[PDB]
Enzyme design. Structure first.
Site, PDB file in Angstrom:
ATOM      1  N   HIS A 128      -9.522  -5.614 -12.998  1.00  0.00           N
ATOM      2  CA  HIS A 128      -8.831  -3.943 -12.491  1.00  0.00           C
ATOM      3  C   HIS A 128      -7.043  -3.581 -12.652  1.00  0.00           C
ATOM      4  CE1 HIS A 128      -8.874  -0.577  -9.850  1.00  0.00           C
ATOM      5  NE2 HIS A 128      -8.115  -0.517  -9.748  1.00  0.00           N
ATOM      6  N   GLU A 129      -6.413  -4.819 -12.169  1.00  0.00           N
ATOM      7  CA  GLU A 129      -5.193  -4.369 -11.458  1.00  0.00           C
ATOM      8  C   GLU A 129      -4.173  -5.114 -13.172  1.00  0.00           C
ATOM      9  OE1 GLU A 129      -3.940  -3.211  -9.032  1.00  0.00           O
ATOM     10  OE2 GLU A 129      -5.497  -3.291  -7.863  1.00  0.00           O
ATOM     11  N   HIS A 132      -4.350  -1.973 -15.035  1.00  0.00           N
ATOM     12  CA  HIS A 132      -3.050  -1.066 -15.063  1.00  0.00           C
ATOM     13  C   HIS A 132      -2.161  -1.964 -15.844  1.00  0.00           C
ATOM     14  CE1 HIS A 132      -5.129   1.678 -12.134  1.00  0.00           C
ATOM     15  NE2 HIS A 132      -5.422   0.868 -11.079  1.00  0.00           N
ATOM     16  N   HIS A 138      -6.925   5.493 -13.340  1.00  0.00           N
ATOM     17  CA  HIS A 138      -8.060   5.450 -12.989  1.00  0.00           C
ATOM     18  C   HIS A 138      -9.082   6.604 -13.559  1.00  0.00           C
ATOM     19  CE1 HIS A 138      -6.469   3.790  -8.890  1.00  0.00           C
ATOM     20  NE2 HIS A 138      -7.163   2.638  -9.673  1.00  0.00           N
ATOM     21  N   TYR A 181     -13.389   4.654  -8.433  1.00  0.00           N
ATOM     22  CA  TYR A 181     -14.099   5.223  -7.560  1.00  0.00           C
ATOM     23  C   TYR A 181     -15.309   4.816  -6.745  1.00  0.00           C
ATOM     24  CZ  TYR A 181      -8.746   6.972  -5.637  1.00  0.00           C
ATOM     25  OH  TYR A 181      -7.618   7.123  -5.740  1.00  0.00           O
TER      26      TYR A 181
HETATM   27 ZN   LIG Z   1      -6.543   1.027  -9.362  1.00  0.00          ZN
END
Ligand SMILES: [Zn+2]
Ligand SMILES: *[C@@H]1O[C@H](CO)[C@@H](O[C@@H]2O[C@H](CO)[C@@H](O[C@@H]3O[C@H](CO[C@H]4O[C@H](CO[C@H]5O[C@H](CO)[C@@H](O)[C@H](O)[C@@H]5O[C@H]5O[C@H](CO)[C@@H](O)[C@H](O)[C@@H]5O)[C@@H](O)[C@H](O[C@H]5O[C@H](CO)[C@@H](O)[C@H](O)[C@@H]5O[C@H]5O[C@H](CO)[C@@H](O)[C@H](O)[C@@H]5O)[C@@H]4O)[C@@H](O)[C@H](O[C@H]4O[C@H](CO)[C@@H](O)[C@H](O)[C@@H]4O)[C@@H]3O)[C@H](O)[C@H]2NC(C)=O)[C@H](O)[C@H]1NC(C)=O
Ligand SMILES: *[C@@H]1O[C@H](CO)[C@@H](O[C@@H]2O[C@H](CO)[C@@H](O[C@@H]3O[C@H](CO[C@H]4O[C@H](CO[C@H]5O[C@H](CO)[C@@H](O)[C@H](O)[C@@H]5O[C@H]5O[C@H](CO)[C@@H](O)[C@H](O)[C@@H]5O)[C@@H](O)[C@H](O[C@H]5O[C@H](CO)[C@@H](O)[C@H](O)[C@@H]5O[C@H]5O[C@H](CO)[C@@H](O)[C@H](O)[C@@H]5O)[C@@H]4O)[C@@H](O)[C@H](O[C@H]4O[C@H](CO)[C@@H](O)[C@H](O)[C@@H]4O)[C@@H]3O)[C@H](O)[C@H]2NC(C)=O)[C@H](O)[C@H]1NC(C)=O
Ligand SMILES: *[C@@H]1O[C@H](CO[C@@H]2O[C@@H](C)[C@@H](O)[C@@H](O)[C@@H]2O)[C@@H](O[C@@H]2O[C@H](CO)[C@@H](O[C@@H]3O[C@H](CO[C@H]4O[C@H](CO)[C@@H](O)[C@H](O)[C@@H]4O)[C@@H](O)[C@H](O[C@H]4O[C@H](CO)[C@@H](O)[C@H](O)[C@@H]4O)[C@@H]3O)[C@H](O)[C@H]2NC(C)=O)[C@H](O[C@@H]2O[C@@H](C)[C@@H](O)[C@@H](O)[C@@H]2O)[C@H]1NC(C)=O
Ligand SMILES: *[C@@H]1O[C@H](CO[C@@H]2O[C@@H](C)[C@@H](O)[C@@H](O)[C@@H]2O)[C@@H](O[C@@H]2O[C@H](CO)[C@@H](O[C@@H]3O[C@H](CO)[C@@H](O)[C@H](O[C@H]4O[C@H](CO)[C@@H](O)[C@H](O)[C@@H]4O)[C@@H]3O)[C@H](O)[C@H]2NC(C)=O)[C@H](O[C@@H]2O[C@@H](C)[C@@H](O)[C@@H](O)[C@@H]2O)[C@H]1NC(C)=O
Ligand SMILES: *[C@@H]1O[C@H](CO[C@@H]2O[C@@H](C)[C@@H](O)[C@@H](O)[C@@H]2O)[C@@H](O[C@@H]2O[C@H](CO)[C@@H](O)[C@H](O)[C@H]2NC(C)=O)[C@H](O[C@@H]2O[C@@H](C)[C@@H](O)[C@@H](O)[C@@H]2O)[C@H]1NC(C)=O
Ligand SMILES: *[C@@H]1O[C@H](CO)[C@@H](O[C@@H]2O[C@H](CO)[C@@H](O[C@@H]3O[C@H](CO)[C@@H](O)[C@H](O)[C@@H]3O)[C@H](O)[C@H]2NC(C)=O)[C@H](O)[C@H]1NC(C)=O
Ligand SMILES: *[C@@H]1O[C@H](CO)[C@@H](O[C@@H]2O[C@H](CO)[C@@H](O[C@@H]3O[C@H](CO)[C@@H](O)[C@H](O)[C@@H]3O)[C@H](O)[C@H]2NC(C)=O)[C@H](O)[C@H]1NC(C)=O
Ligand SMILES: *[C@@H]1O[C@H](CO)[C@@H](O[C@@H]2O[C@H](CO)[C@@H](O)[C@H](O)[C@H]2NC(C)=O)[C@H](O)[C@H]1NC(C)=O
Ligand SMILES: *[C@@H]1O[C@H](CO)[C@@H](O)[C@H](O[C@@H]2O[C@@H](C)[C@@H](O)[C@@H](O)[C@@H]2O)[C@H]1NC(C)=O
Ligand SMILES: *[C@@H]1O[C@H](CO)[C@@H](O)[C@H](O[C@@H]2O[C@@H](C)[C@@H](O)[C@@H](O)[C@@H]2O)[C@H]1NC(C)=O
Ligand SMILES: *[C@@H]1O[C@H](CO)[C@@H](O)[C@H](O)[C@H]1NC(C)=O
Ligand SMILES: *[C@@H]1O[C@H](CO)[C@@H](O)[C@H](O)[C@H]1NC(C)=O
Ligand SMILES: [Cl-]
Ligand SMILES: [Cl-]
Ligand SMILES: [Cl-]
Ligand SMILES: [Cl-]
Ligand SMILES: [Cl-]
Ligand code: NA
Ligand code: NA
Ligand SMILES: [Zn+2]
Lengths: 561, 554
Positions: A128-129, A132, A138, A181
């Protein structure tokens, strides 16, 4: 006396950072000076296909191993690669900051920080990081997000409503994105703040297992990926040309593409639906048939061949695996027997892993053989996958799994195993909780204990709940790692990872032999029962836990170049 | 019958038969090798075209060939990120002309004007596609270094001096490649020169319908294609997120409906969207909207299959909601009202659109005045920036006619855009090949029409009903009405049917005059007709477009 790394909670990235009061954009994004929120990342703010990195000394030992595991997922599913920094102008500096976070895109600032802090040492958090860092925002912030989810504004903690802002800015909305999320994001109470308008995805949003198919499509399209470093082949026999495989025999035997066999299987494994079948019922004893792959070209020199097998024939039938490797000196190839699969239990699909070390172009050769006596069926193979990856060290196959989910009797212990360094260990899977499955690694008394280093130093145990998708590229397996810290102490002052004969409790093997089991180290939130029941973690009521236990003490030393 | 004209002259000649018959002696029948170009060598980056290929359709081309080539460009525009544009002075371009046979160089030879021949008998869309794949840098499939593992070469059967046509990422050998020889290539006699090792594919090699999936993968990987010019969306409802379509939910994702359909169309395992009009009040509506779509052209074709188990009074409304910088929430417009939907069968619909800004398609089911025991179902929605077919011929209970003496089928009458009345003849009676012919017939506008019929191009497409428009290998042929074409008795072939036509009867028994039929006795083999999804639920669709192409004379 087990140690839970998640401290009796199931905190996502957004719960970790919220609990620290970081106040980053959408919980984990570090915005650059005058960067527009949720804006298209231009070509100038992109990394090259190979990203230079440094794993800084502040990182926890387990985190360093987990990050390198995350790079292996990028190497299997994308054409993105990672290399130790060797002086390039821009690079990613992975360090132990407060929480898990990253900038969005290559900010072209030279050393670019990415934090993997305490509790961030989870492979999907790392993935996930790094998405980015690669330039992705997101998913739930899309300008059309209210058409797919409903934000329950009254359930959001006061002062956290701004994390749900949308801006002004194609692949369908991706509920399964690793960048979405969870339904509990910034909740005040037990009620969800995000409700999917399609009820089927209510508990899907917020998955933290792996990349989703749409996450990969967006990344692979961005970097024009037509291959990866470690994917080689996947064959489920779904088309009549059977991925270029060629069947042959000198014995009036053959492999046939079928959708069913009267004695079994009634259907393929892939799950209309086809598999290859070697009939042993009507061939002579000793008759063979070979199914050979097309020529394959390795990039790495180590491979993992895996497939599912079903035996409806005899105990005496067998499957031989050969490699035919081609070199300049012999154009007909060098054929070598690499595996003999004998006395295959009948009546069920079983997963097999075969370790290869081929460095030149080659073919995989599957040879079915009829053994002595009578047979009414044969050998069936399906879902062959080949990648330039290491085979799991051990595999825990749990049969008739579903009966244990949420049940008091769902306290399962694996057979004993020996790690590469000689440590004996056992896995504990706890399915008795109403909502979460727990998993723990234990050291146990073993034959090498007198010659082993104690307390157990920096062995990293990686435990993977296999997503049994037919295609290795589409598996979203659920993986967690722990590392044995030799300085870790218990409440009574003893070393947690000391010799089980010294700090362990008495236990019995299935056969009744006594042994010592050390404390368990793992998590009470390995996976929710809802997610465990999703995708292909359970298939034919079978579950596979893949296990790799390796020494990572070499990761202690400062990364130099 | 005898008044028909077969463009294929009672034969089924492929590219290699056309060129062999002319004695061209090119590399592998249709490749024009450059100066010291190595045969079947890797085409380097320097010998590749840009993503947009400049072209000229030279005046020597037959009128039908010009229309067919532009049709081939539309296939590239739907399935790849390759596009074509009229040459405007770029350094290199493709000059398409009527040379001897069908042929091309392999790659961008960087010679400025680069010839590509579409000669007599080469005006077939898959021939054009094949020749442009050579121009893009592809060779033939059966020359692959591992080809002997997949096919047998019968060396004794090759015409003298033609042996040279057979002597030779990580995609499997592709039997279905549009770039593969058929089994009869350069044969001397009636025996095949190429025989697949597997008996199944013996008659599959040499397909000339469209690109194969592997042909497209190789081309799309070479040009890093992540989109195409004209593909917009495809939805078969196979996944729970239903391709981002938006809507308790009025349209339900189901695998069956008690009153019908018993299953999905795409073909629980399959799914479709259903509006159960029986369980709601009269006037109730159900809305299903696509995700936001981004058009690149100013015209679109929305298509889908509908099943009505409800009343003749139920309807399906199609709206477009177009978004612009000024509009707070979009501009909704009614574009189509689909009424009196026949019940008990999946039916294909086409809707013409002309949207230029980002938009959504809005499907609105409406319960009518009559009692209902079922509802409306929709499946296999496809949207592309293409022109809708002008007419569609739906043939039910198709399989019974293949190879049968009674397999002589005539379509309902249709009116072309210019007002000419026409009918299609599909002949399935031959033991191995299906034939298709275009006829002009007597019509209400005949007193005001130009005669003989000038330069109308009729495009007839046997639809491959794959759920995904990107995976359809539809079988298409075109013919053009030449007003100077004459018959053995000296009359004009395309003259007024009342003057040169034969007497015929409509299904209702009304008399009319039918002109001579023009088409081919080798439209498709019955073996290929029975493959893929040409027949689905025992239904066949022939798509028809008849348009004036006199503007291509320039
Ligand atoms: Zn994030
Ligand atoms: C109830 O149920 C209980 C639980 O199941 C039963 O308990 C089990 O009982 C069995 C039988 O009594 C017992 O088996 C023994 O296991 C011994 C340990 O096995 C592991 O370790 C050895 C040694 O590892 C060290 O050396 C290697 C290099 O060789 C190194 O890589 C390691 O890191 C490690 O080094 C460290 O220690 C050494 C000192 O030992 C230090 O010098 C060093 O510095 C390091 O600190 C491994 O070799 C074993 O692995 C082999 O065997 C397994 C299993 O078969 C294979 O999967 C594996 O691939 C590997 O194979 C090797 O052999 C094959 C040929 O057979 C080769 O082709 C291949 O290349 C490999 O060389 C294990 O990881 C083991 O030593 C011992 O061996 C003796 O018998 C064999 C014959 O089988 C002889 O050949 C040997 O010479 C020995 O005499 C034996 O197998 C289990 O340990 C025990 N389990 C537990 C948890 O307690 C219980 O019996 C049952 N009760 C009843 C009544 O039924
Ligand atoms: C047994 O079976 C037999 C076979 O089925 C039956 O035979 C059929 O019988 C019916 C009924 O008798 C008969 O129907 C008539 O057809 C007439 C012709 O229809 C077509 O052509 C016209 C005119 O085209 C010209 O004009 C347009 C522009 O105006 C132009 O674009 C064209 O290119 C063409 O131009 C050329 O000619 C003119 C001269 O006419 C020159 O001036 C010019 O220079 C050019 O050279 C088209 O308008 C028709 O198309 C409309 O209708 C069809 C079908 O309904 C639609 O698919 C199509 O979209 C279009 O729709 C129009 O109306 C809708 C209304 O909602 C509008 O939204 C839309 O915008 C359009 O305006 C055809 O392509 C036709 O003229 C005639 O019409 C008269 O009746 C209607 C009644 O509703 C009135 O409204 C009109 O004003 C007229 O008075 C009528 O429909 C068939 O022709 C006939 N078929 C054959 C093959 O013979 C037989 O009856 C049966 N027997 C028994 C006993 O059952
Ligand atoms: C045809 O293929 C055979 C099989 O090749 C192997 O398997 C296939 C599937 C691929 O994965 C290949 O990449 C792979 O090599 C060839 O035989 C193999 O040759 C290699 C050497 O090329 C040999 O490896 C050595 O093994 C010894 C230990 O040997 C024992 O243990 C092995 C099991 O591990 C067992 O199979 C043996 O029978 C022995 O009991 C090891 O000490 C060596 O290490 C050293 O070598 C490297 C440099 O190569 C050096 O950097 C290291 O630091 C270290 O000193 C080395 O790993 C395999 O054991 C052997 N396997 C078998 C089954 O025989 C075969 O090669 C020919 O035979 C060899 C014995 C040797 O004489 C070669 O020169 C011959 O070419 C090959 N035949 C031909 C004609 O190409
Ligand atoms: C709201 O949408 C209305 C419907 O739009 C059409 O339908 C949707 C589904 C989609 O396909 C759209 O792309 C369609 O436009 C808008 O009304 C339409 O506006 C267009 C113009 O934008 C009108 O058109 C003209 O039609 C004439 C025949 O009736 C043609 O002669 C004309 O041709 C000329 O067009 C261009 C220049 O635009 C030249 O280059 C050509 O060479 C040629 O000379 C056009 O095609 C259409 O008729 C309108 N339809 C209806 C039902 O009103 C509407 O747009 C507003 O209203 C129109 C009348 C104009 O005043 C617009 O400026 C105005 O925006 C949309 N409303 C808003 C607020 O956006
Ligand atoms: C169209 O013709 C089909 C094939 O006819 C048969 O083969 C010819 C070569 C010839 O010898 C002819 O005499 C044969 O009957 C018919 O289908 C066949 O019908 C027969 C008898 O009914 C049946 O046994 C066969 O299975 C069937 N073959 C196929 C390939 O379907 C069509 O008949 C229609 O279908 C029948 C099942 C029956 O319901 C009949 O009443 C139908 O007419 C012919 N169709 C039409 C529209 O005439
Ligand atoms: C998390 O949720 C709880 C429960 O909703 C929040 O507490 C509640 O906050 C409301 C705010 O309007 C309180 O209502 C008001 O109470 C006062 C008296 O205290 C009254 O005069 C008003 O008319 C109104 O009713 C409510 O009492 C309070 N409930 C409890 C049990 O504390 C809480 O604030 C939320 N926390 C965060 C961080 O968002
Ligand atoms: C993935 O592949 C595509 C090509 O298939 C790459 O797109 C190309 O990107 C370059 C810029 O990096 C564009 O260059 C253009 O050059 C001209 C001068 O020749 C200049 O005038 C333009 O302003 C522009 O810079 C090129 O147009 C573009 N091509 C297409 C068809 O999009 C893309 O960069 C590749 N992605 C990666 C990550 O490598
Ligand atoms: C497709 O995209 C790749 C990059 O993703 C392009 O490959 C680069 O090509 C240049 C030369 O043109 C080389 O210098 C680079 O090393 C290549 N990069 C990689 C990672 O391969 C390729 O050129 C693009 N294809 C087209 C037709 O534009
Ligand atoms: C574990 O608990 C669950 C829930 O109570 C039981 O269903 C399992 O019982 C097993 O399955 C049933 C259908 C029956 O065959 C019974 O005899 C089995 O024991 C139970 N499993 C075990 C292993 O105890
Ligand atoms: C296709 O075959 C079926 C039998 O399997 C026929 O019932 C169809 O006939 C049509 O439908 C019936 C209900 C009736 O209306 C009849 O008059 C129709 O012809 C037949 N369909 C066609 C188009 O021939
Ligand atoms: C699984 O269940 C079957 C009955 O369906 C039983 O016969 C078998 O022994 C069980 N297997 C295990 C490993 O418990
Ligand atoms: C074709 O085959 C016949 C029969 O074998 C042979 O005599 C003749 O020479 C061949 N012709 C060519 C052109 O190869
Ligand atoms: Cl991990
Ligand atoms: Cl497959
Ligand atoms: Cl065409
Ligand atoms: Cl150029
Ligand atoms: Cl279509
Ligand atoms: Na399968
Ligand atoms: Na469907
Ligand atoms: Zn060719």
């Amino acid at each position: 006396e087990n140690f839970d790394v998640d401290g009796g909670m199931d905190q996502d990235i957004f719960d970790i950072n919220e609990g620290l009061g970081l106040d980053l954009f959408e919980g984990d994004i570090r915005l650059d000076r005058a960067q527009i929120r949720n804006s298209i990342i231009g070509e100038k703010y992109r990394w090259p296909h190979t990203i230079p990195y440094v794993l800084e000394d502040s990182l926890e030992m387990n985190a360093k191993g987990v990050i390198l595991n995350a790079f292996e997922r990028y190497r299997l599913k994308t054409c993105i690669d990672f290399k130790p920094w060797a002086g390039e102008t821009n690079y990613i500096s992975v360090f132990k900051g407060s929480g898990c976070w990253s900038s969005v895109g290559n900010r072209r600032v030279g050393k670019q920080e990415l934090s993997i802090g305490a509790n961030c040492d989870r492979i999907a958090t790392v993935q996930h990081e790094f998405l980015h860092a690669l330039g992705f925002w997101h998913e739930q912030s899309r300008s059309d997000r209210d058409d797919y989810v409903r934000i329950m504004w009254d359930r959001i903690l006061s002062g956290r409503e701004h994390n749900f802002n949308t801006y002004s800015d194609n692949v369908p909305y991706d509920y399964t994105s690793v960048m979405h999320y969870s339904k509990t994001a910034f909740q005040n109470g037990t009620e969800p703040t995000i409700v999917t308008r399609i009820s089927d995805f209510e508990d899907v949003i917020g998955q933290r297992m792996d990349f989703s198919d749409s996450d990969l499509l967006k990344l692979n399209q961005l970097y024009n990926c037509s291959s990866s470093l470690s994917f080689m082949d996947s064959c489920s026999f779904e088309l009549e040309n059977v991925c270029g495989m060629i069947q042959s025999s000198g014995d009036n035997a053959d492999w046939q593409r079928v959708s069913q066999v009267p004695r079994g299987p009634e259907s393929d494994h892939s799950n209309s639906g086809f598999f290859m079948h070697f009939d042993s019922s009507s061939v002579n004893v000793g008759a063979t048939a070979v199914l050979e792959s097309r020529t394959l070209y390795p990039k790495r020199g180590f491979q993992c061949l895996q497939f599912y097998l079903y035996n409806s024939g005899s105990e005496s039938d067998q499957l031989n695996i050969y490699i035919r490797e081609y070199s300049a000196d012999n154009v007909d190839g060098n054929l070598t027997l690499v595996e003999e699969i004998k006395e295959i239990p009948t009546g069920s699909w079983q997963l097999y892993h075969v370790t290869l070390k081929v460095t030149k172009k080659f073919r995989v050769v599957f040879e079915g053989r009829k053994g002595s006596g009578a047979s009414l069926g044969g050998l069936s193979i399906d879902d062959i996958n080949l990648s330039e990856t290491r085979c799991p060290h051990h595999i825990w196959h749990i049969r008739n799994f579903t009966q244990f989910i949420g049940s008091p009797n769902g306290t399962l212990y694996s057979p004993p195993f020996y790690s590469s360094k000689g440590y004996a260990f056992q896995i504990y899977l706890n399915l008795a909780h109403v909502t979460n499955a727990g998993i723990y690694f234990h050291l146990i008394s073993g034959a090498n204990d007198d010659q082993l280093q104690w307390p157990c130093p920096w062995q990293q145990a990686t435990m993977t709940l296999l997503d049994q998708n037919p295609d290795i590229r589409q598996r979203m397996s659920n993986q967690r790692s722990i590392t044995t810290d030799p300085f870790m102490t218990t409440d009574n002052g003893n070393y947690f990872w000391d010799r089980p004969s010294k700090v362990g409790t008495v236990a019995l093997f299935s056969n009744g032999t006594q042994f010592r089991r050390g404390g368990g180290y793992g998590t009470s939130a390995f996976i929710t029962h809802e997610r465990l029941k999703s995708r292909d973690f359970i298939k034919g009521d079978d579950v596979y836990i893949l296990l790799t236990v390796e020494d990572i003490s070499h990761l202690n030393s400062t990364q130099i170049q």
